[PDB]
Amino acid sequence: QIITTDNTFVSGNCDVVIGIVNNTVYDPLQLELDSFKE
Amino acid sequence: QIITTDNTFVSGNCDVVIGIVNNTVYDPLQLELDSFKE
Numbered sequence: 001q002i003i004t005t006d007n008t009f010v011s012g013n014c015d016v017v018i019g020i021v022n023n024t025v026y027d028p029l030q031l032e033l034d035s036f037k038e
Numbered sequence: 039q040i041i042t043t044d045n046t047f048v049s050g051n052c053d054v055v056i057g058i059v060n061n062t063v064y065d066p067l068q069l070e071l072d073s074f075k076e
């Protein structure tokens with residue numbers, strides 16, 4: 001599945017988790033607002 | 039964590055539940071929309 005803000009939850013910043021990897025997380029709704037009135 | 043409409047669910051009116059307290063549940067979508075539309 002696509003990694004999104006509905007499939008995942010956020011807790012803290014990125015400097016704590018030993019194995020954290022940089023990747024894009026797609027935000028539903030936030031993209032839509034741009035289509036509605038860019 | 040902040041109490042939001044994603045963390046809780048809604049069922050019924052504020053009368054039957056014993057010991058219900060008044061507070062604000064923060065809906066993220068409305069907050070964004072009041073910025074998007076201005």
Ligand SMILES: *[C@@H]1O[C@H](CO)[C@@H](O[C@@H]2O[C@H](CO)[C@@H](O)[C@H](O)[C@H]2NC(C)=O)[C@H](O)[C@H]1NC(C)=O
Nearest residue numbers: 013014015016017018019020021022023024025
């Ligand atoms: C994940 O991304 C962050 C930035 O979003 C990277 O940290 C920055 O890396 C640049 C070089 O590309 C530096 O100039 C910045 O000073 C860094 N900032 C911080 C706060 O570290 C981070 O290295 C990336 N991690 C991986 C594994 O790619």
Ligand SMILES: *[C@@H]1O[C@H](CO)[C@@H](O[C@@H]2O[C@H](CO)[C@@H](O)[C@H](O)[C@H]2NC(C)=O)[C@H](O)[C@H]1NC(C)=O
Nearest residue numbers: 051052053054055056057058059060061062063
């Ligand atoms: C939560 O807020 C509601 C109002 O939105 C309160 O309802 C009022 O209660 C007082 C008595 O406490 C009545 O005189 C008002 O007529 C009520 N108004 C409405 C619109 O219901 C409710 O009491 C509050 N609850 C708590 C625990 O503070």
